[PDB]
Write a protein that binds this ligand. Structure first.
Ligand SMILES: CCCCCCCCCCCCC/C=C/[C@H](O)[C@H](N)CO
Ligand SMILES: CCCCCCCCCCCCC/C=C/[C@H](O)[C@H](N)CO
Lengths: 271, 246, 37, 239, 271, 48, 37
């Protein structure tokens, strides 16, 4: 059944049991079910009214923090593109890969800095290119006319830009693990370069340029932070314990497998 | 009860025994201008009999290597009868039309004709010239053909840079020589102004275009005539002054 | 939809009728019936 | 005054933003509107109009004869006549139409399609045809018994000869991106083929070759989303 | 009849037909009417409740995006004029030429940049000159006193200027195609330089200068973006498939006519 | 307009802040949700 | 919870059910009773 909760659970007073047939201690872990032995049936306990707040452990409060999704280099080609995938950095990727399916909105923030670090009063255009839209081929091409694409003009001396992005998938949810092939036909035995590529997660390209007709002489890094909101999760799975190697693939190392618990002297010494 | 038809307007009639349905352009019937949309002060005239009848233009030849024909309809009836006289003497004009196109053939011929209207059908000038003060523009007899019509040069782009495949968004019919021998399209007064002059401005234009060429076997009649009979339904004229031709 | 100006064109901004483009014919044709007799 | 803070998004000019602007002419009242026939309210009204498909877009073709599918008498039975892909946002016969040029302004389309075949030929020439739509999977079928396993319609040449094959919505996902090729072969819609049921019979003193006009449109299930740009226009300098 | 719609159309269950006289498949395309064969009369189908939104395909949502209408060069004469016509660029001109008549408001935006690209803290005056008003003849003339013309003072370091423009035509709608002559008399056969010029679309001049008494030494480009709003359309027409050549004329090339569908191997090969 | 003053905290991008942002796609409606078994609501369901 | 936009995804943002992860068994087992007979 579904139960609500404003705080954690309370405890009721308990006494000593002296009788046969009533065994709350013997469980069965072979049945695939968690043990349910509570405190009131194990040890003599007192009554407490536990008013500790459990509100900040939900999915919304756990995921609604701006992490880091992507750094885009513009060491000025005149423009810089960036395929939108949130698996570049291993800080938010782990939290996202704690679950199998997620459906959420996004809130991008763009923090742009210079070579050493600075804010020169120039102009920057960020443009979103959906899958199929023409990607700009130059710093003054016509793809920057953005008659239908969402674009953002901001200065380096402005506060960091911020937009809100809806759920833009053709499926009903984003899946971080896809057990299958996007295409058909005969698949090779040597190198499956398309195994585990969900086409419902490719969202497009993010381009950035400096609005000019000449060529401004500066190199700059633009950082894209995402804050998830209105998030829903499905099918939780374990958290990764091995170091990451690739972006779109869960590759690990065959040799040199890191243990998930550090070594001690012996099993009979808890120190 | 669907293929035989008769249309009587004024003192003229048009009978047909095989035909398609009667099309009505944009689902609106041509009627007189209301007192809300009107802006001119002087009272218009309404002959309603002498000007609302079937005027027949000359016949165009239907051969194997044809390209098409186009007319400017408020300009084809500027020399014919009381409608032409009223359109020359008056200054403002407003009417709907009803266009019938007859092209009959036997049961051994084959072909296809696309007959459609285009509101504000602008003729383009053919030639690659990006300088505005030297580019080639069409002549007066190309823009306003008159009661003698004008043939196309590139029916693939409607002589306007617009593909004729998408010309089915306009009010249109097909003269298929095995289904119907004629086509009919009733058109209201489509314009952004209530009254306008019927001399230096042509509202729309018909276009008969051979999509599937005319084919037959040896012995059959070769030259297939094409006739168009039109009717200015609900005509209104205004601003009577001296007569001007163009 | 709040407007801060005297003129209504400075403000901020489900009808369909495809039967005048798809079937603008005088005699209505039915679905299951043949179009021409 | 009131205390306030400025947030990110300040001093930006968003293109697709909905915001008011200060007027220039005070106390203005425009010209009164009149009634002009043919007012459109959405773009789905233009997508449900038939429009000639350019199925004969191959080489060695003249200007207008690209719009016609040639049909003639055969000698071997079961022969194939024509074939084309269904994707409207893909280069081919669905590019000369009107639903293909409107669904190229939008990224994701949905709904069922419709292809109308009209027979331009002699009144004494008869025959039959089998139009078969095949969902994704293998390539174009090689036989007619392979094509009959899909979704087909048998259409004979008679007094009407204006058949209309519907293309239903058979997809896994709700929508399909209007970008196909390579890694986007996951959004293909199938193949529409045209075979010969019996033959194109014809009496003497009658031409032995006629044409089919194919037209394409959408249905009431049609839906479009995510406005993008088209790739038919190109411009180097200002006109 | 007029029908409303919150989503797309639904489908009802269908069975097999076995009877004569009821033929929903045979149409008549010669009658100038679109086929009406639905799914329930063609193939056995199931029932679905289609809740896909059709809201963002209307005229208002299709035209209310800021495109590009005109670039004005001020490579400092001291001032720069620009005849107001939205047919300069082939991105918005195509969408506008999809229709015959349009009645709408405008929302201009002015984005001004420098030679390479910059924002120097100077002052700029944009002035609208209606048809008949005197056009400025110098950088310090009296036409810049704007006692009755709408003018805008903005700095280069300010956000881009924005105004809202009403329906300023003497007619009831803007027409993009005009089949006629503005004047009377005998018209020539050689060169009709006035064919297709609607006088109800000429709206005036847009002038721009730098507010100064000396001559500031900078060259700058000002871009004029338009967002249509409160738009109504009439008499839809096909979309242009040929490349553009001129601004006020629908000229194309006689030779080298581009086909509206790319070539393939044969008609019997769909690949 | 209205008189106003700006306070400390202006022009800062707080990471864990709860604030609205301007959308990018106007009039958007996402793909309809379906029922997927095993929806989690808090992290205390995984700790037991 | 005030929103200034037409779209609801641009706005600003206690259910628990551990019995589908802890004890997803068909036959319900009691607390004081032994799990298997
Ligand atoms: C330039 C201003 C607007 C910027 C628009 C960018 C937003 C479009 C992308 C939406 C991002 C959705 C969240 C991530 C999607 C998928 O899960 C990732 N590909 C994960 O691999
Ligand atoms: C300087 C600040 C105010 C600027 C005022 C400029 C607005 C006046 C022009 C209105 C523009 C109306 C939209 C376009 C009109 C016609 O359709 C074009 N000439 C198309 O050829």
């Amino acid at each position: 059944s579904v139960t609500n909760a404003e705080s954690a659970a309370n405890t009721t007073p308990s006494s000593h049991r002296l009788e046969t047939g009533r065994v709350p201690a013997l469980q069965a872990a072979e049945t695939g079910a968690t043990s349910n032995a509570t405190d009131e049936n194990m040890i003599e306990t007192r009554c407490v009214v536990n008013r500790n707040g459990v509100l900040e452990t939900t999915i919304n409060h756990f995921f609604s923090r701006s992490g880091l999704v992507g750094v885009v280099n513009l060491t000025d080609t005149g423009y810089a593109t960036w395929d939108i995938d949130i698996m570049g950095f291993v800080q938010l990727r782990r939290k996202c890969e704690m679950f199998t399916y997620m459906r959420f909105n996004a809130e991008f923030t763009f923090v742009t800095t210079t070579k050493n670090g600075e804010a020169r009063p120039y102009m920057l255009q960020y443009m979103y290119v959906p899958p199929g839209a023409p990607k700009p081929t130059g710093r003054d091409a016509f793809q920057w006319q953005t008659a239908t694409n969402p674009s953002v003009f901001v200065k380096l001396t402005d506060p960091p830009a911020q937009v809100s992005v809806p759920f833009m998938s053709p499926a009903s949810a984003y899946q971080w693990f896809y057990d299958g092939y996007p295409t058909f036909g005969q698949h090779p035995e040597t190198s499956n370069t398309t195994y585990g590529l969900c086409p419902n997660n490719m969202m497009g390209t993010f381009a950035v340029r400096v609005v000019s007709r000449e060529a401004s002489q500066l190199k700059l890094q633009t950082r894209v932070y995402m804050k998830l909101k209105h998030v829903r999760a499905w099918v939780p799975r374990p958290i990764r314990s091995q170091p990451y190697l690739l972006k779109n693939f869960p590759n690990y190392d065959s040799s040199k497998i890191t243990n998930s618990a550090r070594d001690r002297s012996s099993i009979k010494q808890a120190n | 009860s669907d293929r035989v038809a008769q249309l009587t307007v004024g003192n003229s009639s048009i009978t047909t025994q095989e035909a398609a349905n009667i099309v009505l352009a944009y689902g609106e019937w041509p009627e007189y201008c209301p007192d809300t949309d009107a802006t001119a002060v002087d009272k218009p005239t309404r002959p309603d009999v002498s000007v609302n009848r079937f005027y027949t233009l000359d016949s165009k030849m239907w051969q194997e290597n044809s390209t098409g024909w186009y007319w400017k309809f408020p300009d084809v009836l500027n020399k014919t009868g009381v409608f032409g006289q009223n359109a020359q003497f008056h200054y403002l004009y407003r009417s709907g039309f009803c266009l019938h196109v007859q092209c009959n053939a036997s049961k051994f011929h084959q072909g296809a004709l696309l007959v459609a209207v285009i509101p504000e059908f602008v003729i383009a000038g053919r030639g690659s010239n990006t300088k505005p003060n030297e580019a080639p523009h069409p002549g007066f007899t190309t823009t306003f053909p008159g009661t003698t019509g004008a043939t196309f040069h590139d029916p693939y782009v409607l002589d306007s840079g617009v593909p004729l495949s998408q010309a089915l968004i306009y009010p249109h019919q097909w003269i298929n020589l095995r289904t119907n021998n004629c086509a009919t399209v009733i058109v209201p007064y489509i314009n952004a102004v209530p009254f306008d002059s019927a001399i230096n401005h042509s509202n729309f234009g018909l276009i008969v275009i051979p999509v599937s060429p005319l084919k037959y076997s040896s012995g059959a009649t070769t030259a297939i005539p094409i006739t168009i009979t039109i009717a200015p339904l609900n005509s209104e004229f205004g601003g009577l002054r001296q007569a001007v031709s163009q | 939809n709040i407007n801060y100006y005297k003129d209504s064109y400075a403000a901020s901004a489900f009808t369909q009728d495809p039967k005048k483009f798809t079937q603008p014919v005088l005699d209505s044709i039915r679905e299951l019936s043949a179009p021409l007799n | 005054g009131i205390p306030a803070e400025l947030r990110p998004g300040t001093n930006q000019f968003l293109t697709t933003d909905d915001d008011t602007a200060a007027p220039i002419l005070p106390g203005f009242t425009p010209t009164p509107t009149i009634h002009i026939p043919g007012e459109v309210h959405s773009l789905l009204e233009l997508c449900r109009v038939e429009t000639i498909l350019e199925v004969n877009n191959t080489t060695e073709a003249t200007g207008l004869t690209r719009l016609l599918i040639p049909v003639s008498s055969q000698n071997k039975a079961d022969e194939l006549c024509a074939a084309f892909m269904v994707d409207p946002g893909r280069i081919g016969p669905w590019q000369s139409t009107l639903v293909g040029q409107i669904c190229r302004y939008y990224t994701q389309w949905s709904g069922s399609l419709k292809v109308t075949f009209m027979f331009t030929g002699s009144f004494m020439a008869t025959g039959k045809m089998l139009v078969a739509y095949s969902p994704p999977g293998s390539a174009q079928p090689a036989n007619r018994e392979t094509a009959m396993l899909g979704t087909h319609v048998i259409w004979d040449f008679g007094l009407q000869s204006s058949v209309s094959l519907v293309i239903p919505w058979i997809s896994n996902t709700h929508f399909r991106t209007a970008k196909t090729g390579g890694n986007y072969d996951y959004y293909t819609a199938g193949v529409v083929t045209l075979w010969y049921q019996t033959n194109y019979v014809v009496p003497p003193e009658t031409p032995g070759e006629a044409y089919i006009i194919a037209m394409g449109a959408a249905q009431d299930n049609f839906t479009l989303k995510i406005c993008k740009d088209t790739d038919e226009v190109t411009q180097q300098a200002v006109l």
